Amino acid sequence: CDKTVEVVKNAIETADGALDLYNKYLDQVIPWQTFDETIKELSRFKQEYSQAASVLVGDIKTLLMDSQDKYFEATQTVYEWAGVATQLLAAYILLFDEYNEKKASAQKDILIKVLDDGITKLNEAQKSLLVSSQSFNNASGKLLALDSQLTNDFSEKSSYFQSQVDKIRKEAYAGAAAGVVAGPFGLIISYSIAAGVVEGKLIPELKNKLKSVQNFFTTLSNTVKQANKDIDAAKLKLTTEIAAIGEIKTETETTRFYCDYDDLMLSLLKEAAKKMINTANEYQKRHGKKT
Incomplete structure (x- = not known):
């Protein structure tokens, strides 16, 4: 029954890897907390700037708020997938108890729903990331204009x-x-x-x-340009992984789940599921889930 074991492990690991592009890449490589504090601070000294500079500073604040907003939007979409995935994977694990052919079929439907929901939700979230990136880019343009303005x-x-x-x-x-x-x-x-x-x-x-003051904005300018590059990179890795999910889903669909699993195979399959349950729990926790 080793063949099924490798398909199923690969299915969970691929889904898990996609989730982790949010949980361990996007959530980490962009300084979200720093942007949040900066956004809340950006109106400081608003009356002191020149008219032209004041307009740019305000628009930068608005664009950074939008980048954050769209990141939060992507986050809730992924969070929804995580919340369903964790219940599904727990159900998958329990189905090994007093095993039979009906439970094997259910396990199969369950993993395919994890993958399918993944594709749907991750694709929706790609649209949010796109707008977040566009807003960082527009904020960058204004920060570049701000430097020349502040110089003058x-x-x-x-x-x-x-x-x-x-x-x-x-x-x-x-x-x-x-x-x-x-x-x-x-x-x-x-x-x-x-x-x-x-x-x-x-x-x-x-x-x-x-x-x-001009230095502060230079730093923000560098930080925004970097964030823009990183979110674009994340969005591309996700495109790739979303396709990979599709592939393994197809192979899973034609895979036979009803098998006489030994203790090792069972261990490997449950741990694979538990690894993604862990990922999903860590992600949802960061994003405010209580218990």
């Missing part, structure tokens, strides 16, 4: 920079000749710097602050 805004000779300087100086002169003056983007400046008592230090302080 944050250069010393711009009216933007000059306004920032004038405001800080005006405030310093108008108050007491001690203490501190609040500037843009969280900058705090001592009176002596702001008022030029200590010579030539205000401009460098502002530049250092502004450069740090």
Whole structure:
């Protein structure tokens, strides 16, 4: 009965491998948690940016929210498959108890449903990943525009920079000749710097602050480009594995399940099922399943 054993193991392992492209690749290679925190932070200092930069920052936030949203959409689709797969595979395992030909037929129908539901759900999720990728790509384009915009805004000779300087100086002169003056983007400046008592230090302080803001977006820009590349890679690996599921499903359909399994064969088949039950449980747990 060794022939059936290798087809059936291959069926479960292939399905499992596809699930793991979410559970151990997509869920890991893109910093989802970091994007979530960044999305929630992105409106910070919104009134301080130039009009042009402010529009880009807002649109980047919206696109990153969409990338996240569509990732969550793909996730729920895969989660549904996982939840059904775990009940099915547990049923598969129990069917070995007091074995007979009716239970063998049921086992076969069950594994084919795992594979078939896999194809259907994973194909639906591919559409979500596609839109997530498109949104990362569009966010990237805007982040590239943002760099050039911030360069123009944050250069010393711009009216933007000059306004920032004038405001800080005006405030310093108008108050007491001690203490501190609040500037843009969280900058705090001592009176002596702001008022030029200590010579030539205000401009460098502002530049250092502004450069740090531009740097933040440069980092986000790199991180988005990387995410875009990785989600595209994941979506391609999934296309391949979805086809592989189809193949093994076909061979499974013509495979005879009713067999006089020995202890070894039984062990191997149950463990194969248990491996995917484990994958599915870990995935659903990460995505909020309680028990």
